[PDB]
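Researcher: Batch entry, complex prediction.
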Amino acid sequence: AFAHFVLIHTICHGAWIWHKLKPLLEALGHKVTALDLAASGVDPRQIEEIGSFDEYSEPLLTFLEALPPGEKVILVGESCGGLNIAIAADKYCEKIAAAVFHNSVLPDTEHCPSYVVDKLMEVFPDWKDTTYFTYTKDGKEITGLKLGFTLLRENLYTLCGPEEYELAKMLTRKGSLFQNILAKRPFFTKEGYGSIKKIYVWTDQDEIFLPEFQLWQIENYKPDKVYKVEGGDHKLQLTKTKEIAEILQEVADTYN
Amino acid sequence: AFAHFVLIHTICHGAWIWHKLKPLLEALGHKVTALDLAASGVDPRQIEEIGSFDEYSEPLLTFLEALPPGEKVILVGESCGGLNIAIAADKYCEKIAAAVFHNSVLPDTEHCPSYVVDKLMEVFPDWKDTTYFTYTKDGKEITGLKLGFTLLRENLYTLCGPEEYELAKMLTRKGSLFQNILAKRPFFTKEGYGSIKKIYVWTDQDEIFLPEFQLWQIENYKPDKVYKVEGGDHKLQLTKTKEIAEILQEVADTYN
Ligand SMILES: CC(C)[C@](C)(O)C#N
Ligand SMILES: CC(C)[C@](C)(O)C#N
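Model: Structure tokens for the complex:
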């Protein structure tokens, strides 16, 4: 079967991270939409203009709003993209056939929205050469960050070639986890986000979202299905593109 | 010998086009700077804020200005980048060891700055699915454009793989040739731009900067050296990356 996949990049990244996976999925006959979230990729906004993870998710929400009645999509989020999925699901659950998490945070409905992010910071506290700054938006102090090049090289693009790593150094932008904003955000709902089918994809060779963290997430909020990809790194859509496409095809053949 | 190469992308593109060549040059021991020109790549400005090719060249001029006395660089410009080179050379000729043109326009000093662009439009009048728009800046009506995806696929990235082509569809932005502005711009000088060493690199398999045009440019303004790369396409830094690096190494060993 064919599906319409909506690929969602992580913070400090953009649609470009999916440049290898998108054409492969299309070669299988699928429709693919790779969005640039707010102040990401070539989006015209700067991070200082964004005050929450919800605002950051605007392009995704706007896209879903534009889907004609009856049309459903399979959301695929990497790393922090799981949060955009949760936000989107609480507004357009009926338009989501399923959500695939790609070495991604997996929010739940029993704890605050920042719950898994707080846990992530405990498991991976040292972001190496990453730099930080603060800005104010809507009366709140937000911590912005720019991923360090060493962190990118050693923990995120561990096995990616020099040409993919180069794209990251050239294209990654300042962003934010909006951690303190998520902490005060209303909980994700059981009726919306809680109702969608969730497929968790990961590799135990991820050098940032460590096994301890991902296995902790799986136990915390049981996914409907779990796929473990052998080898690769945090950026499976670059290092195990074929494997990811195969998994997504099976998801398309399972949920609609 | 080692040199400091400053790679200059063409309109509607960004530093990202050099993601394959940059690491290869560094692997040879060179220092490489790949800039995003105004309203290009991840630059925060939008094209409607730019009123001339000179303004568009701001990041390059600012970079050269920051070079300490005595430090020289080898400029490498692709496609329309030759115009940024001419503009830069008339302000910082002493900081330029040489300029390499990569399937690029080659301005001269005998005719108006838009001369070769006007000729290009005669040789390649049909830009296929490219779209156009107009905006006003500093009292002048400027024609903006967004490269069509079919034009990108068939004429610019003719032999590039689907993954490189995908990056182009995701990252190319609205831009402008500022043709009418160039037409009224003071001529490039013989003392500045005219004095720099110019190396012309091209392939007769370029599907947009056709042989008729490139050979016309070579006859119009004699380069100091000409390198013809066999095969490849308009984006030699992607399809003949190794060959381009070899040529640049020889240039580094020839001019300083
Ligand atoms: C490093 C991690 C938090 C990110 C930016 O989401 C990725 N990849
Ligand atoms: C199509 C051509 C004018 C451009 C944008 O410079 C390239 N490549």
